[PDB]
Amino acid sequence: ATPADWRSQSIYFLLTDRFARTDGSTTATCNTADQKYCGGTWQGIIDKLDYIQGMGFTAIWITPVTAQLPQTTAYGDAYHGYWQQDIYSLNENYGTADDLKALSSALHERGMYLMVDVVANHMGYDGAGSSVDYSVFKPFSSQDYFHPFCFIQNYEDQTQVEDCWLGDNTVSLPDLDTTKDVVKNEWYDWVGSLVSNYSIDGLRIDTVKHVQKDFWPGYNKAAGVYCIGEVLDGDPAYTCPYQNVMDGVLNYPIYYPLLNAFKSTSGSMDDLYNMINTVKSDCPDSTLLGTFVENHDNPRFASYTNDIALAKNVAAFIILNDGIPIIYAGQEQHYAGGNDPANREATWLSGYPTDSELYKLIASANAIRNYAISKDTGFVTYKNWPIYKDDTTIAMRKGTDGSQIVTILSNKGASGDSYTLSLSGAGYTAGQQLTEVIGCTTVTVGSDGNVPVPMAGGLPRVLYPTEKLAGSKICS
Ligand SMILES: *[C@@H]1O[C@H](CO)[C@@H](O)[C@H](O)[C@H]1NC(C)=O
Numbered sequence: 001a002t003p004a005d006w007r008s009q010s011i012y013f014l015l016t017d018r019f020a021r022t023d024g025s026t027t028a029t030c031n032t033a034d035q036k037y038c039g040g041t042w043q044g045i046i047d048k049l050d051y052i053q054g055m056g057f058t059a060i061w062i063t064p065v066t067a068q069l070p071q072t073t074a075y076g077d078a079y080h081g082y083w084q085q086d087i088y089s090l091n092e093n094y095g096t097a098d099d100l101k102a103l104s105s106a107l108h109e110r111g112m113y114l115m116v117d118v119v120a121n122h123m124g125y126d127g128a129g130s131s132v133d134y135s136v137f138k139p140f141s142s143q144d145y146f147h148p149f150c151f152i153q154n155y156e157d158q159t160q161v162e163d164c165w166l167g168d169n170t171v172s173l174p175d176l177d178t179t180k181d182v183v184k185n186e187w188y189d190w191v192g193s194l195v196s197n198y199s200i201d202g203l204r205i206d207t208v209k210h211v212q213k214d215f216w217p218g219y220n221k222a223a224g225v226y227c228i229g230e231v232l233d234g235d236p237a238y239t240c241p242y243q244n245v246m247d248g249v250l251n252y253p254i255y256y257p258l259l260n261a262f263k264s265t266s267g268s269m270d271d272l273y274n275m276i277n278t279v280k281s282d283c284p285d286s287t288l289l290g291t292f293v294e295n296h297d298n299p300r301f302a303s304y305t306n307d308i309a310l311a312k313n314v315a316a317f318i319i320l321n322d323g324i325p326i327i328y329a330g331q332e333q334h335y336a337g338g339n340d341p342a343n344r345e346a347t348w349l350s351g352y353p354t355d356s357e358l359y360k361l362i363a364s365a366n367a368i369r370n371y372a373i374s375k376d377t378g379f380v381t382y383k384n385w386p387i388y389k390d391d392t393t394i395a396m397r398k399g400t401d402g403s404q405i406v407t408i409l410s411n412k413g414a415s416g417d418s419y420t421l422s423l424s425g426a427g428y429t430a431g432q433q434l435t436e437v438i439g440c441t442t443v444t445v446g447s448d449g450n451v452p453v454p455m456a457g458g459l460p461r462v463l464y465p466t467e468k469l470a471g472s473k474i475c476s
């Protein structure tokens with residue numbers, strides 16, 4: 001599927017080993033500290049698609065599928081998929097090639113997309129870097145194909161970042177020489193084959209900043225689908241330019257201010273507001289980026305605060321910002337794990353409650369976003385517009401005039417005071433009746449133009465023209 005095809009999507013990102021076992025167990029042990037394979041499979045995912053689609057997601061992103069180093073290392077098993085050894089084989093832990101194709105067709109039979117995580121930067125090896133036996137890797141079975149061993153000593157040196165090895169001497173990550181024509185052609189041919197063999201709709205590309213830029217356009221083209229890159233850097237001036245060589249990148253620039261804005265009652269709404277504008281302007285296309293506040297490479301949101309109302313606000317933002325929302329399996333169950341491997345909790349241990357607070361929050365927000373898109377072909381291309389802020393509040397507007405969604409978000413928390421906010425800028429016609437689609441109440445636009453927004457318990461508010469909801473299953 002195309003970048004255009006992807007704008008309207010919203011992604012549930014999951015760890016294949018950790019989302020759902022074939023046996024459907026909700027009790028199967030998974031001590032994250034043990035870093036072992038816990039049992040999750042592609043077929044397990046298939047059996048839980050009702051749970052995923054019931055939150056209003058239109059796609060999933062799954063961890064890499066290539067066969068991994070087999071050893072149980074001092075850092076555990078390759079359960080996450082980032083330590084590949086044989087790229088023309090699948091990781092048997094998740095099932096068979098038929099299983100992967102089954103997941104793909106099952107997603108498609110529901111009108112959903114499959115996104116797959118891929119690594120081009122490196123392989124994985126159990127052992128010291130200098131001692132690597134290259135013969136294990138397929139097809140890159142000789143030192144020939146790799147950058148000479150060295151570690152990234154200085155991250156300000158972009159040449160070191162690209163030419164030296166990630167990892168360490170316990171689990172080393174032999175770094176492919178992605179400037180060699182033979183390496184390019186092998187990867188380019190592989191990625192097209194992968195996508196065709198399994199009917200893959202999109203790619204999430206790992207460790208993008210660790211590969212020289214002139215590698216990516218050819219890779220993206222070969223893939224023949226939307227590619228969104230992990231560029232692990234919070235500076236828009238470093239990260240957005242990668243969108244010049246690749247369809248999208250994950251929105252790490254928004255990530256930091258977003259997290260700070262909502263992780264405490266004293267978070268800076270100013271930084272968030274500004275970053276939205278900086279990204280909107282200086283990024284080739286903000287609507288092709290992916291928004292998230294939680295993933296497998298950072299502490300989970302709920303690890304910073306257990307305030308449910310804060311979690312509600314940051315989730316609403318992810319869904320309603322420009323670009324593609326990305327929610328990380330477990331976030332909807334208020335998972336609170338810290339840094340790797342604590343943030344790789346098995347989803348099945350939650351019991352998959354479909355009536356939990358954040359599950360319902362996310363369903364409501366996706367419901368409106370999805371509806372708005374079905375009516376307003378200009379929604380996805382309309383660049384989100386921050387219209388208001390204060391010390392505890394931010395409001396924003398997205399959608400063609402007369403059909404816009406206006407979102408008011410707060411970091412007051414669950415003990416926030418009741419009160420009324422007068423909102424200038426919404427651009428609704430005076431006396432117009434609007435629905436608040438989370439709590440399902442109504443409000444009328446003032447004559448002064450302003451909107452009388454009832455604020456209570458630090459809850460999120462999402463407004464949308466009541467007449468426009470006609471015939472939707474929203475708020476019945
Ligand atoms: C795609 O299918 C062909 C033929 O079955 C196979 O040889 C090739 O290895 C597959 N490509 C990938 C990336 O697995």
Ligand SMILES: [Ca+2]
Nearest residue numbers: 162175210211
């Ligand atoms: Ca590299």
